[PDB]
């Protein structure tokens, strides 16, 4: 019942719920000499307040309460969830309305601020229609929204976006099986293990703790960069582990189609085997927006393909996914069709590896010391040896 | 969702706002100053 | 007499001077949506205005009212006093690189404005310490596009025994140029393969100063720290009809200062950036292991200063140069010798890595600020435990 | 003119400016956010 409510009321006076297990609590707060009130969740346990969800970040409330209100959550009507169903808040900091199974009617996890917890869902819902996204704080003490966001694009090949207002300044670049070259996740971490559920009714991204000594999660600051922040034991603060973008190849098309960014030359900026920069002028002035063109044009069949190897996938727009094949099917395939103008696999580890297919030009491409994938590139059958 | 556009290195100037209108014959199209020390040209119509 | 200004006057009503070769024009102008009016140079043949240089860019004009005269020994500018020079016949004459000079009418200017710079380094101008005056002359950023007041960024010298640069806010050091290696710093990415400019370093009795020269006049070529502190050469080639950012600088989080810890180097290669040097081991392994590496590193087997040996780094921006003595009359092999004869020695470096030319500089102390490249860099000879190398 | 501090990724927190005090109590350390995601502890009287 210290969790959960029902016919009770929630004053700014005084009452908190809070979760099963310590972790998380539900309440009211006034951040900075703000006098703002706001509902939200944080970190119970921890000195310096972490808020992981709002209820209302920009319809700010010395008086302002929330119960229920027929089949509905009210909060005075500043905001509201549109038979006795209650309130409860669980062990992982999900504030639920059911009835006294998981047949939620309403979740916080579904209504996402700057963070993602474990086992919330970065990623659309194809049966409701809902994508869940993270929209950045305007700074530290004020939780209303900024002009970040990370989000899910749907799309046959989805990838992740962080835009500033409605502009792309970097990309995640698609689900390879194991990570997103741009969620640069340790994969032999102790503590954490991370899910891309893609199926018929939802696209997410989840990650799930390993060990309950450690805190994680996902924030996307005000400054516009997608953190990991662990809570160890061994310390009084959370530590970036790791921050996106971290280079200007990262930045969305740092460089011009069928070019790759490379953090280990200068210019950054290199042509695909096979492709010459289009406007030289630029290029020698290092503006590279041009791109390359290929230097000797397509005869479609008898065409050949440039193996890329470390290399971020390209803008997957124009991809098409068939998971029932492998390679040398999707060469094939990537053949046949005249405007293929690139293939690779969609999942590595898989023994059916799955083909991908871009028509159209190349984009937002940088390479790797380490790691990447494969990208088998269309040239001229003479180019083709290189 | 228009998709035209390109990032360089420096900061967004008048002139380079001129340069964003190149990307469609319609639409509202601007320059974006971006972290890094990078700007973007983006078309926010097409 | 389109180009110098004497007994007379010059005011917003209505005169300009304008260089030997059209490059330039001094004059009034204001910006934007302000009414402030400010004295400055700007190219002349550019419709989108580049200002190069501004007298009062602290002190604008109030009303729309102000005058630019010579007043005895003085450049003087006032609007019913606002800025001033202080200090035969004098001329204020402003030359075909874009100098505003006073001069005896009667080489030895009496006052220049290439040594009060603004955010802009022009060619032939000099970044750097004039050791006559004892003036530091750095690069100060605006605080915007529209405002050509004073902003929170500056590129200044630090004119040590080995001298480099520095990227401040304010007084935090943001960022450090590396030290001078004969044909350039780190920090400061020039092409030098440019067909049209060159570049020196001077370090001698008058100057300890960087500049660069146009070799081909059809280009126009600066530096300039924009309103965000980014260090940024644009190059204005008869080709465009826009400024192109040929560089930025810094440009990576393993161009900050101290991304890394001591005796760490910063990699854009690896997750995370640091990286011990060899024979060292994480300072706070509980931190590395969070990726926490404040700590940075610490040497794995104790000194005995007799019979210690190095480990080579290659291609390493070499480290902070606060402690370092260089001995440019000696050689390499000559340099290990000294190193080992002073256990303080930490690690030793060439000094100059054009061949054939040498040199030596020795640090003592903790090696801070490094980072490492695919290509160029330098050798960085670190001093280990006879067992560890 | 003061010299230790360190460089971190994130931006500041309020944990972060006493960790940086805890440098050279003595001195003035603050803690000063910078560009590409990163932030400065430095340290003024000394
Ligand atoms: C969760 O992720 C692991 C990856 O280590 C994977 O093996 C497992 O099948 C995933 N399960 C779900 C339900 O996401
Ligand atoms: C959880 O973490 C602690 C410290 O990080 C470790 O000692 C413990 O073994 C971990 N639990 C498991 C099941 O490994
Ligand atoms: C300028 O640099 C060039 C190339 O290193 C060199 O030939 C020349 O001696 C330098 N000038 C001075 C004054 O040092
Ligand atoms: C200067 O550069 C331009 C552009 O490349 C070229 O056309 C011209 O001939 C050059 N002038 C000289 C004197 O080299
Ligand atoms: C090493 O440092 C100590 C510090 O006081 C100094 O006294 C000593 O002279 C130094 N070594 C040499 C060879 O100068």
């Known amino acids: ?30 951040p900075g000499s703000s006098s703002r009130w706001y509902l939200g969740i944080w970190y119970k346990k921890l000195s310096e307040r972490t808020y992981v969800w709002v209820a209302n970040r920009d319809n700010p409330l010395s008086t302002g309460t929330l119960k229920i209100s027929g089949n509905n959550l009210v909060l005075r009507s500043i905001w509201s969830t549109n038979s006795p169903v209650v309130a409860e ?17 309403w979740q916080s996890f579904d209504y996402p601020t700057d963070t993602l917890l474990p086992e919330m869902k970065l990623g659309y819902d194809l049966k409701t229609g809902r994508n869940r996204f993270l929209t950045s704080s305007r700074n530290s003490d004020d939780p209303s929204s900024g002009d970040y966001s990370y989000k899910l694009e749907p799309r046959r090949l989805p ?27 340790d994969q032999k971490s102790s503590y954490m293990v991370y899910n891309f559920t893609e199926n018929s009714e939802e696209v997410a991204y989840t990650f799930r703790m390993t060990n309950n000594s450690f805190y994680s999660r996902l924030t996307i600051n005000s400054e516009g960069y997608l953190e990991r922040l662990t809570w160890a034991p061994s310390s009084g603060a959370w530590n970036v582990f790791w921050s996106s973008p971290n280079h200007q190849c990262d930045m969305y098309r740092m460089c011009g189609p069928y070019s790759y960014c490379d953090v280990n030359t200068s210019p950054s900026c290199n042509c695909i085997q096979g492709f010459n920069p289009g406007n030289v002028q630029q290029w020698a002035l290092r503006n590279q927006i041009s791109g390359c063109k290929r230097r000797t044009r397509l005869s479609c069949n008898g065409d050949g393909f440039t193996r890329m190897k470390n290399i971020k996938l390209p803008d997957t727009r124009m991809a098409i996914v068939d998971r029932s094949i492998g390679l040398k099917e999707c060469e094939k395939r990537c053949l046949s069709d005249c405007n293929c103008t690139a293939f690779a696999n969609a999942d590595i580890r898989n023994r059916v ?22 990208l088998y590139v269309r040239l001229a059958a003479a180019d083709s040896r290189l | 969702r228009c998709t035209r556009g390109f990032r360089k290195l420096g ?14 014959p319609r639409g509202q199209c601007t320059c974006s100053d971006s972290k890094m020390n990078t700007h973007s040209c983006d078309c926010k119509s097409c």
């Open chain 2, 11 to 24: 900061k967004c100037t008048t002139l380079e706002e001129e340069k964003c209108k190149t990307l469609y």
């Open chain 1, 353 to 374: 590896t799955g083909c991908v297919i871009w028509t159209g030009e190349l984009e937002d491409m940088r390479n790797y010391a380490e790691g990447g994938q494969d």
């Open chain 1, 89 to 105: 808040l669980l062990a992982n900091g999900n504030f639920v309305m059911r009835d006294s199974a998981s047949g939620f009617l």
């Open chain 1, 159 to 185: 990838e992740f976006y962080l835009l500033q207002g409605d502009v792309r300044e970097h990309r995640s670049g698609p689900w390879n099986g194991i990570q997103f070259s741009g969620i640069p996740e």
């Open chain 1, 1 to 30: 019942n210290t969790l959960s409510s029902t016919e009770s009321l929630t004053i700014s006076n005084n009452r908190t719920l809070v979760s099963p297990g310590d972790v998380f609590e539900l309440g009211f707060f006034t």
